[PDB]
Design a protein around this nucleic acid. Structure first.
Ligand SMILES: Nc1nc2c(ncn2[C@@H]2O[C@H](COP(=O)(O)OP(=O)(O)OP(=O)(O)O)[C@@H](O)[C@H]2O)c(=O)[nH]1
Ligand SMILES: [Mg+2]
Lengths: 83, 75, 82, 275, 885
RNA sequence: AAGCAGCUUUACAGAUCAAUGGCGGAGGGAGGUCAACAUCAAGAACUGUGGGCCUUUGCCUAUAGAACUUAUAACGAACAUGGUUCUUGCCUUUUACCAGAACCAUCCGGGUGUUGUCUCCAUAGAAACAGGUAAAGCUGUCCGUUACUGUGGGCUUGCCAUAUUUUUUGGAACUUUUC
């Protein structure tokens, strides 16, 4: 599907991921998988209650993520065109 | 279908949060396609670092369904 | 007999192409393929003394699946009352 | 379907008609398929031989482009005690690399280097040899419940059973053929413009011809070079053709008659003009 | 007159993507990858770039109606006027493209096609240094010839990934007319031939390392691409990865199940034949022969491909190309192989440690780029540069060190200040686009761009760095001078036709020494100009631009010459002496070992997974004495006292004042070696370089008084005088270079070639390879370079175009010229080639008269003799013993 | 490559049989040894439209369209003549001449697009009305099927596995403070 393909477009792009646990991990994306589980680098972490920390590397299971924010530029990415 | 890529991490001490509240940090030996992760020298982290921490076992395996996120503390 | 002889080559080419062979035998087989492109100019020299109409053309059409009478007996001695 | 109409432009043929015309044309076709045959014998090498005042052994001879050649500078540069003599610099060397083996080349043109060594296997002895066939003179190639797909899964084009069609041996001969037999459509040319004998003197003749006809190959090449060297381009504003402007006049009428009648009508008219 | 090139910004052809999305992918280092396209002569490299360009752009103005059809190739990256006329790539050229793989992940890819002719092996050395992976394009007919073997061995050497494209598959059916089983064995023979030379990695179409292509007909595919278009619809989605592994490699299929053995009672082919080659050849057969109405039904039924109404009225070659473009839709399987082969975690650090010194990663504050070459790109002088760290904007000021300075500067970086490096301003930044330059404001890490305003600061390569603090300057790494594979050994001496045009010649020789990076342009003391090149075509490409592009003057040009080297064959009251008695230096000479010379030509010293490179060969003197003693069996004293390896030569201290006062020697040691470099560069015979001489410093005398001013300045010319006395006493010889030859002829034309090698002097055919499946065979031999004048076209005229050779100088074969060099009675005939015993005398005497060393009226022979250096009273003492003639 | 589902049609039985919405239609095809206008050699080159600067030109930026001809460079896989000038060659002189150049022309032709004309063969319709250009359903009205069903064709589709850890066969439910 296109939504996961787009995630590949995100790769190497500062992206923000919100977990279903309520946290927020904003940082660079090292790797992604069709499962959608995403691992980040230099992520700035926001706990559900707002406490913010900084973690060198991270991996998050795909099932957990509520939504992903990807670079605005991606929007005109080549694959998207219908025809 | 596809195996998750943990390949760089293996042999590194890793903290990971399991299911509702629990955080477990241990050396990681094995991973599978469901993300089931087996790590040795497991320790259950708590508020008081030396005190409420208790080790689990010599080898512990984790269902991939209870993993929320994985962070490796190390290189 | 070009048509059947091409079929002999094609099976013989299937030997050193899709099948494993002993080594010393193998370089001789590909040398035959090398003589093929050189057009057989080193197997075509002999004593063609007879003209093609001076040899009365008794091209004997015997096959090697015929029992061939094995006439050793006329090389023995006999006694002509003839 | 084969032509646009009776205005007779822009023909288009099918494959069996096109291979049949290819087969009749074999006394007059080009009969050469590699461009490496024309190595030092193309027109770029002909232009260089004119400008360098060199003679390709089958090529034409020209006047010197720069006849003021006999001037020289007394200098120690190209003396005999300077030069190592290993290989005699042939004129074929001077045309193949015009800027290396020539002191002072000017108005020379850059020649084409090689083409890939053309190994085209053709078959002409038997019609019953297949179109795809391991010809002689090719070197041999000496070498050397787990998984299950659903049945009736077939490769692509498995429902079509034969690889060699009865027109493939004709079509691959047309594929490697020079112009115009590699094309199945094209515009019309004028009977003047079909140069039938042009390909004969654009090739090497042979060693077997006598000397009075090898000059005729060399003299027809010289005319070919001079047309390629000096193009006279047509101007576009020439909109008044003669027959078209005479047709617009009330004093000319039009009909269709026989050629021999029109030839005898121009001999009688041309006699009455001069008399 | 020089190129064809769109100058106007508004006529630059638009892309399918919007090209700003492409430039934003430059921000990410992992996203962009740099592939250079290398391969043999006429392999389809520029044609392969035609496929990637016209599928990336929407309408090219240079593309004509014959080019839109199949008839003539758009050699889009052959933009030079000479490259159009030669039909041949000459310069490195490239294009930056946005490309998607089979997983539809778009990324910025910087292509750079090298020229495939073997005299332009310097231009692919730039492409090997620039590229992350190489895309080695092979024609299926010639297969793996010897020039392929080096391009595999070089890409292993340069720590560069590789990915193979087997090209020209139309020749496999339309030229050669192989049956489909017999062409599978052609492909299996080639892939088994490239796996022997890639010593570690196996390459196979399952492993996505090999792409099949026929570039004239405009398609390319992997087997992963081909399954994913047409077979992935039918088999289950969990099966597509396992089906494509059962596809190549002697496994057969019949009615739903796979076997390694052949099926009984069924005429069956392998899986690659039945599923790929058999459907491929049916496309070749039916687009040429099947009726266009019946074929239009087979393309919907099997390929879901609609032929247009205009497409049915095509000629057979454009119709075959239009079908094979409809099928094999884009080059997504090519890009997917380029994506999956490159691993930056393994290679990018070893590539940096090969181009520069091995060290830790420089910080991200440092701007740090490698200036590859200076490119005359589109009527301007650009610099080809690849950025390894930091960020570069237009208008910045950068420090540009020429790479010839980077040996000392990296050595002076250790320190157990100021004015170190000239500074130029970044005037303009552009992306190479083939026929255009696309301007960009900045250039990020990892990408090749073109920068105007750098080219005056260097010759032939540079390093570009812009450091912030002085402490940060301590850790930056300088690049090594670039390893152009062929040594320039083909020699042409020139002077202008008018003496007043000499400043315009010296201007254009400075452009050529920048633009053609494989040249060695030097000026003799007689005033003549020597150009060293790679071959006949390399000079003929050079002297065109020298006469037509860069200087409009006419020039006088000699015959082809070569460089000669000097050596010995023995050694030898051996002493040397200055007119003042304060200095007395005795040097002996000796031939080095043949294995010792051959390994130093390979730029590394050692054997059996243990080797020491020449740059740090002094830095481990304990390890050096282990290598020299074990591998080569030297003495323990000779192993410890070696001072320097200059190119193909060695100095050994063997003296008793070293056992007395080596500390006195050590303060004078750096200039004995400097005088040694002053002697190897110009030898005693004919001012030629010295190769393969083991020098032994036998003794040295020190004057009763120390002047640091005078003893330093006097020992450097005397040591160069002292090396001559050792060499001339040691039975000197002359060395000539030997080209290695790679001839491709048809098999019946072989005795023409064997007679053609006998007409030359020192030619020998060493190996004759039957090229499988083809009527032609490969001939590998050698020729001297001084005999290889017009060798290339003597071969082609005698074989009527069915022959072709490549002349190259990879292995540095120097062979003794068969004469004796000191022959006063050698017969040198005028205007004819001298006989074989007169060759060493002839080549020296003519060289000494080009240089002006030996001056005669017409032919006066003052040979290289051991009497202008030694005293004349000792020279009479040498004649009476019979030692010196 | 097939059944079903979806989509698009379709001969249609239809809901409406209103206002609608889609697609087509508001003066034919194929042709002509027919014509008239354009246009055909150049920063690898074109035109139109929108915006910004200077004061129309020009520049920059955005956008749309580009027939034919060109890369071993030219409409033409063909190739003739003439003029002037320079340099030769036959040598009594002048045409006529020899065969190289440079700059120019003439002549036999060729492509493409418009518009008109001519031959042949046609005829729905709503081709009904009203506006104008150099052009036309170009515009406005308009009507043919019809915008929501079921039978019948095609695919652009589904990913062929539909409950057992990363998605759609439930870790859900319940109670408490503050405001
Ligand atoms: N049969 C065949 N010939 C091809 C194909 N691609 C290219 N050629 C021919 O190969 C020759 C060289 O083509 P290019 O694409 O210029 O090759 P290249 O790699 O640029 O060659 P270099 O410039 O020498 O490096 C030409 O004669 C082409 O027509 C192909 O797919 N099939
Ligand atoms: Mg090329």
């Amino acid at each position: 599907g296109i939504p996961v393909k787009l995630l590949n477009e995100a790769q190497g792009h500062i992206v923000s991921l919100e977990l279903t646990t309520g946290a927020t991990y904003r940082g660079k994306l090292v790797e992604s998988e069709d499962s959608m589980n995403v691992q980040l680098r230099d992520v700035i972490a926001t706990e559900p209650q707002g406490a913010v920390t900084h973690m060198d590397q991270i991996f998050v299971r795909g099932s957990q993520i509520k939504f992903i924010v990807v670079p605005d530029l991606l929007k005109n990415a080549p694959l998207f065109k219908k025809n | 279908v596809s195996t998750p890529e943990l390949k760089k991490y293996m042999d590194k001490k890793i903290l990971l949060n399991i299911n509702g509240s629990r955080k477990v940090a241990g050396i990681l030996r094995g991973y599978d396609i469901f993300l089931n992760v087996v790590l040795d020298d497991a320790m259950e982290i708590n508020g008081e670092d030396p005190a409420n921490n208790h080790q689990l076992g010599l080898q512990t395996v984790i269902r991939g369904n209870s993993i929320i996120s994985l962070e490796a503390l190390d290189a | 007999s070009k048509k059947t002889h091409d079929m002999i080559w094609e099976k013989l080419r299937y030997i050193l192409q899709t099948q494993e062979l002993s080594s010393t035998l193998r370089e001789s087989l590909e040398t035959l393929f090398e003589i093929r492109q050189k057009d057989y100019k080193s197997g075509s020299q002999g004593l063609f003394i007879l003209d093609p109409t001076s040899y009365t053309v008794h091209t004997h059409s015997y096959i090697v699946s015929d029992e061939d009478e094995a006439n050793k007996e006329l090389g023995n001695f006999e006694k002509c009352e003839n | 379907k084969k032509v646009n109409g009776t205005s007779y432009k822009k023909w288009s043929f099918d494959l069996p008609e096109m291979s049949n015309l290819y087969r009749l044309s074999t006394p007059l076709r080009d009969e050469v398929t590699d461009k490496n045959y024309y190595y030092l014998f193309d027109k770029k090498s002909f232009f260089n031989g004119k400008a360098l005042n060199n003679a390709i052994p089958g090529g034409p001879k020209f006047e010197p482009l720069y006849p003021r050649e006999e001037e020289e500078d007394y200098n120690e540069f190209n003396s005999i005690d300077r030069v190592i003599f290993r290989v005699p610099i042939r004129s074929e060397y001077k045309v193949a690399f015009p800027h290396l083996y020539n002191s002072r080349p000017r108005s020379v043109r850059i020649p084409w280097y090689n083409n890939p060594v053309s190994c085209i296997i053709q078959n002409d002895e038997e019609y019953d040899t297949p179109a795809l066939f391991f010809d002689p003179s090719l070197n041999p190639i000496p070498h050397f419940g787990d998984f299950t797909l659903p049945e009736d899964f077939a490769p692509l084009l498995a429902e079509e059973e034969e690889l060699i069609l009865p027109n493939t041996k004709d079509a691959m001969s047309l594929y490697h053929s020079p112009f115009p037999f590699n094309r199945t459509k094209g515009k019309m040319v004028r009977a003047q413009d079909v140069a039938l004998a042009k390909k004969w003197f654009l090739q090497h003749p042979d060693e077997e011809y006598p000397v009075k006809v090898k000059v005729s190959y060399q003299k027809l090449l010289k005319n070919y070079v001079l047309n390629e060297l000096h193009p006279t381009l047509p101007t576009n504003h020439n909109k008044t053709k003669l027959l078209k402007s005479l047709k617009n006049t009330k004093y000319f009428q039009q009909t269709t008659i026989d050629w021999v009648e029109a030839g005898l009508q121009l001999c009688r008219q041309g006699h009455n003009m001069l008399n | 007159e020089h190129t064809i090139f769109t100058q106007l910004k508004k006529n630059i052809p638009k892309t399918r993507y919007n090209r700003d999305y492409m430039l934003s992918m430059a921000n990410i280092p992992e996203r962009i990858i740099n592939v250079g396209v290398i391969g043999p002569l006429h392999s389809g490299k520029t044609s392969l770039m035609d496929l990637l360009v016209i599928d990336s752009h929407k309408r090219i103005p240079d593309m004509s109606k014959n080019v839109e059809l199949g008839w003539k190739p758009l050699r889009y990256l052959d933009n030079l006027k000479q490259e159009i006329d030669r039909g041949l790539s000459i310069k490195l050229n490239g294009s930056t493209l946005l490309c998607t793989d089979l997983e539809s992940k778009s990324r910025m890819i910087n292509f750079l096609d090298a020229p495939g002719h073997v005299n332009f092996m310097d231009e692919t050395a730039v492409a090997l240094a620039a590229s992350d992976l190489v895309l080695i394009v092979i024609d299926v007919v010639e297969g793996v010839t010897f020039v392929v073997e080096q391009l595999i061995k070089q890409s292993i050497k340069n720590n560069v990934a590789m990915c193979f494209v087997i090209n020209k598959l139309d020749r496999l059916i339309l030229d050669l007319k192989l049956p489909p089983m017999d062409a599978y064995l052609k492909l299996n023979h080639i892939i088994a031939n490239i796996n022997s030379f890639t010593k570690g990695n196996v390459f196979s179409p399952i492993d996505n390392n090999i792409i099949f292509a026929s570039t004239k007909l405009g398609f390319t595919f992997t087997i992963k691409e081909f399954v994913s278009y047409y077979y992935a619809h039918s088999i289950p989605s969990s099966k597509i990865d396992d089906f494509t592994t059962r596809l190549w490699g002697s496994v057969y299929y019949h009615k739903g199940n796979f076997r390694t053995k052949p099926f009984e009672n069924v005429e069956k082919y392998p899986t690659f034949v039945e599923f790929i080659l058999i459907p491929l050849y049916k496309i070749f057969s039916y687009a040429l022969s099947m009726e266009k109405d019946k074929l239009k039904n087979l393309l919907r039924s099997n390929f879901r491909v609609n032929l247009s109404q205009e497409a049915l009225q095509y000629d057979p070659q454009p119709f075959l190309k239009h079908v094979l473009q409809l099928i094999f839709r884009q080059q997504t399987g090519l890009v997917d192989a380029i994506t999956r082969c490159y691993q930056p975690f393994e290679l990018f650090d070893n590539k940096t440690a090969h181009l520069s010194i091995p060290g830790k990663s420089t910080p991200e504050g440092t701007l740090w780029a490698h200036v590859l070459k200076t490119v005359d790109y589109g009527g301007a002088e650009w610099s080809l540069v690849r950025i390894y760290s930091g960020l570069l904007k237009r208008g910045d000021t950068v420090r540009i060190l020429d790479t010839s300075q980077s040996e000392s500067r990296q050595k002076r970086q250790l320190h157990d200040e100021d004015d170190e490096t000239p500074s130029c301003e970044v005037e303009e930044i552009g992306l190479l686009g083939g026929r255009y330059v696309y301007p960009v404001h900045e250039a990020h890490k990892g990408q090749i761009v073109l920068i105007k305003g750098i080219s005056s600061a260097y010759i032939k390569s540079a390093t570009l760095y812009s450091v912030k603090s002085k402490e940060d300057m301590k850790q930056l790494k300088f690049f090594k001078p670039l390893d152009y594979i062929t040594e320039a050994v083909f020699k042409i001496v020139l002077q202008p036709l008018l003496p007043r045009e000499l400043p315009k010649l010296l201007d254009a020789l400075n452009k050529i020494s920048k633009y053609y990076p494989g040249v060695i342009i030097k000026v003799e003391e007689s005033g003549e100009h020597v150009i060293l090149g790679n071959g006949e075509l390399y000079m003929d490409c050079l002297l065109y631009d020298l006469r037509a592009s860069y200087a409009k003057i006419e020039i006088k040009i000699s015959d082809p010459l070569t460089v000669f080297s000097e050596s010995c064959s023995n050694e030898s009251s051996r002493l040397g002496e200055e007119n003042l008695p304060g200095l007395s230096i005795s040097v002996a000479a000796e031939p080095m070992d043949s294995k010792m010379i051959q390994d130093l030509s390979r730029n590394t010293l050692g054997k059996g997974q243990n080797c020491l490179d020449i740059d740090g060969i002094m830095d481990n003197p304990r390890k050096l004495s282990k290598i020299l003693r074990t591998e080569y069996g030297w003495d323990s004293l000779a192993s410890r006292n070696v001072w320097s390896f200059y190119n193909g030569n060695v100095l050994i201290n063997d003296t008793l004042p070293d056992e007395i006062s080596p500390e006195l020697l050590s303060k004078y040691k750096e200039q004995i070696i400097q005088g040694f470099y002053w002697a190897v560069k110009e030898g005693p015979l004919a001012e030629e370089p010295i190769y393969g001489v083991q020098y032994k410093l036998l003794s040295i005398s020190v004057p009763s008084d120390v002047n640091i001013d005078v003893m330093k300045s006097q020992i450097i010319p005397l040591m160069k005088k002292a090396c001559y006395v050792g060499l001339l006493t040691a039975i000197p010889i002359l060395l000539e270079p030997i080209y290695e030859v790679d001839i491709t002829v048809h098999a019946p034309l072989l005795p023409i070639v064997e007679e053609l090698m006998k007409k030359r002097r020192g030619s020998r055919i060493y190996k004759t390879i039957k090229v499988a499946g083809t009527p032609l065979l490969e001939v590998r031999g050698q020729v001297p370079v001084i005999e290889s004048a017009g060798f290339e076209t003597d071969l082609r005229l005698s074989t009527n175009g069915l022959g072709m050779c490549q002349l190259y100088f990879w292995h540095k074969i120097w062979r003794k010229v068969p004469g004796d060099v000191l022959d006063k009675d050698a017969f040198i005939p005028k205007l004819k080639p001298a006989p074989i015993n007169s060759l060493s005398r002839d080549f020296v005497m003519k060289t000494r008269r080009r240089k002006g060393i030996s001056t005669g009226g017409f032919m006066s022979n003052d040979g290289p003799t051991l009497e202008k250096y030694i005293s004349a009273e000792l020279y009479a003492q040498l004649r009476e013993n019979g030692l010196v003639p």
